[PDB]
Amino acid sequence: TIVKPAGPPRVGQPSWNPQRASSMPVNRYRPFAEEVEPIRLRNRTWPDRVIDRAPLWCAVDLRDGNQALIDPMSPARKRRMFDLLVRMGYKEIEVGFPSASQTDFDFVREIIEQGAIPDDVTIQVLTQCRPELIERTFQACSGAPRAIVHFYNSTSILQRRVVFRANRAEVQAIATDGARKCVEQAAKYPGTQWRFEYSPESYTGTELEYAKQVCDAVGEVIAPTPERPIIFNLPATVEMTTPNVYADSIEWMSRNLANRESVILSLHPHNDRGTAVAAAELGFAAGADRIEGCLFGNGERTGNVCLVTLGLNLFSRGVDPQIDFSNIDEIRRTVEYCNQLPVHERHPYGGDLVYTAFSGSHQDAINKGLDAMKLDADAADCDVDDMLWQVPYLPIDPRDVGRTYEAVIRVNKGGVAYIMKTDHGLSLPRRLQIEFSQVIQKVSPKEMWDAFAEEYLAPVRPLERIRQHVDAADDDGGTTSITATVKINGVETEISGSGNGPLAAFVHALADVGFDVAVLDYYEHAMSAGDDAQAAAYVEASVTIASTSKTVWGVGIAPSITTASLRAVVSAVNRAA
Amino acid sequence: TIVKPAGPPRVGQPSWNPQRASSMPVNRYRPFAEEVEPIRLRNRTWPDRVIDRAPLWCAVDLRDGNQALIDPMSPARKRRMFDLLVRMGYKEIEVGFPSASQTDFDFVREIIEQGAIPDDVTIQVLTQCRPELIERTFQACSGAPRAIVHFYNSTSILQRRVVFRANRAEVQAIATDGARKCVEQAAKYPGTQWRFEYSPESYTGTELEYAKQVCDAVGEVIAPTPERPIIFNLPATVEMTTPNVYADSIEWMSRNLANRESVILSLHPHNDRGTAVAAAELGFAAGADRIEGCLFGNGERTGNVCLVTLGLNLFSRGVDPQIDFSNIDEIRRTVEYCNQLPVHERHPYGGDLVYTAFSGSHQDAINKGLDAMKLDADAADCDVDDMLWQVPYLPIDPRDVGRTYEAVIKGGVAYIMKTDHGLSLPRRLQIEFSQVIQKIEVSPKEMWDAFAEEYLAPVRPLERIRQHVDAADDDGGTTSITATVKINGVETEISGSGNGPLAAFVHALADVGFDVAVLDYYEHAMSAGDDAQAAAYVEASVTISKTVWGVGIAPSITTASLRAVVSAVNRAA
């Protein structure tokens, strides 16, 4: 059960703080400086540096992400993730651990043999240091034009004592023997341009002076140069303390590593304290060159640092991340298919709720921000979508990541979608729900329905549809023509058009009477099932009217699927007025 | 869709970095120093401080959390969250926005009238500065033994310009008139120990000198003392930049605010950049006294800072958070029930997978760690459960929060069919098809071949060659159809009437021995444009009774629907 803390307050605790000591066993845990070492970088510069360039990114979704899954990726899921990363713009991708996993070996073989690797992309493979594993790693990459061989071994104080029971020389030799084998194997495969990355695994549990010693010894074996640099990757394998301390450690390593001009300094933070993004950002300001992570923070336990958050955290402060996030929903859907794990509702940039506003005062402030941008754009003769984003409560324009701001209205088990379906049998398409909620913004079930009817169902001006004759060709792929009687602002008139179906025909007919309806989307569903059966149709259109253009939804309801579609078009035109 | 970045690399971009410029509109966004101001702090000290005591916590789950939910808390869920917060050890709890919401007003009344507030807990209520709203707030707290009245107004450069259209003096007067009204109402409600909190809302988009001026001016009205302090709560209403810059802001405020001994400096970070936890911790090292957050990071958009993460981040480094997390599963189950939102699988400390090791190598190292602990413990006559935790890959003993270490040893139909073929299958069709596919992993290319072979290709027993639709002109009139079909290869005419073309065609099929009833029907466009293709999905009961899906694809809404009926009839057989 949960036990209310009841111990004494600390000595010195202010009288305005009535908190009590808990009975958690805090004595089983020590401050970082005692667990590992004191890191004091008094002359640090990272606090005074603002990031002004994207780092070199490396995506490790196919390895660190993959092996953290409940269900590891099938061959199809691996290819889909790899193609997604390539398409987004990543140029270094860790594709697996091929010497430890036959499925990973076969994946690396498949991408090499089927020419799936672009010429500006370098695949990365992880291996432990045992000589036969290193050999198998090189075998896996046979025929690659280029590849990064990432070898690692654990250097932490704790692992040296309880896992390896070894001294400093012994654990360093594991790494330098690995490096020696890498040099020897690279000489055997002259057809591939080999590059190396070494990680002192569990770096954040390792003395910095020892980390430097091991990395330097590995570097002497590899003998990197400015034109062929080595990657030293410094993982927060477990995130052990606050991100400022990790940043201090990176700045120290960046200053003190030998042959620094021949080093690409790489960060690999995990999220055990929930501050992986902060560790990466402050560490990059501290002199790192490269960051390893996963899309949406997948990876061992709490995950690797989120590459989406890091990239969009640049974008939103005016630095190009050099990765495309223009359609974050596509990225999300692909990630969820590949990982079989959802992106949380509140995940930065991608989560369901992150461009939502529930508060009336927030919604009002957002509309004022939006209105003022449009006014300044009209004045300067510019597209508002190209102007400086100046909107309270929305860090970015959701349209810049392919999303839409959502002003959610509460209905007095609730919510517009749910009640529309239960009370009126309509399944509103998601973008319709958002549009309609914005109409309501500018509520009881009755009020909701009444607003829906006056907006989408009732209007009869400027366009009313009386009747029509549909002449559909009998044969597949044939033309449908329509003649319709309509009232335009009260006045009966006859219109004509043709199209691949009655919807298209009707749309084309209305163009001659001054309504340009460019159909963007369309959905239909049944309501009920017999002689009482009806169809509900929803049409999204960019509409322009004679005597500017607006994207709007129309709704139509009718016993015929054809007539419901036509009613929806009329509904859209009248919304646009 | 996603387009690979293809613009020129930056000048001076290193040879070893081949990344290209994206086409994202970065020029719509400015560095923080330009959007707001540069950092004013000389000789910061927060980078040299390690937290060594717990802050004063305030939980805003019942307000910031609650108002951010799609399903807001019932009165029962509210009491449950309140009691949870009390039992865990929280002493300040923001219980609502009662002047804006009758449900919050009724809840405040309820916990006061029922005598539900322990002697060491102070409730906190949120209000805007309008005088009528302050009155209503005090009415809600009538009879409270003590209460924090938290009043706020927005101070940021942006909101001053485009929300309020007001200058600095006017915006300061709103806060300061608010404070005066609070002082007035406090004198009219005797006995209650009134306490105040002021937030310059959107603080992170506000000039620091100005934020200081407003707070100082509010404080002059309230006249707090060291025994009766005021809370100045400085929110990252939007998280706008890196946590070090927030922390520099906090340290600056802590050093420059007037009457500092009579101020509890409070942080209220949101998570827009994923760094609220970091902002809080560095902010606390910067000299803040107090932190407002929600359990498991609930709240507007990306949420308020996570109280669980902050508290257990102290525990795991040897500092008592003064809050009990001994049973994090109870905490989580209650939070999930109250918020009706899940804790993510990877959420620090509480998520499903955070104490799981799938890697054989990690499992081995974990076991070596636990064994050496058991050796040191047998040798010292101690329980291992009281010994220093020393286990690779596990920052804490999962038992210390009621959990356990777990050494652990789905075709994607919807996604593949929508992504590769433009088809959004109705949920029940997804199920039907993905069981037919388990029976054959199947590649995407293999999956499509099977979809086509079941839904699109068959032409027996029913093939539809062509048809004439005679649609009623007027609404509500009849539609007739005449179609040329083949039954088991045999050309035959069928004909029928109904309320639309789809009904007419199903009734027509009755004459030929197929009794079809439309149970469900869905249709969607397959591209943009006033001409593109339609996908239709029909679920029908079909005798010569099996209930089956059909799929039709065609340039016309009408024809796609008819093909979907044919598809269904052929699956039935």
Ligand SMILES: CC(C)C(=O)C(=O)O
């Ligand atoms: C293999 C190494 C880089 C690792 O994943 C880690 O230390 O987290």
Ligand SMILES: CC(C)C(=O)C(=O)O
């Ligand atoms: C009311 C204020 C403190 C708020 O919730 C915020 O600024 O985030």
Ligand SMILES: [Cl-]
């Ligand atoms: Cl019909």
Ligand SMILES: [Zn+2]
């Ligand atoms: Zn890792």
Ligand SMILES: [Zn+2]
């Ligand atoms: Zn807030």
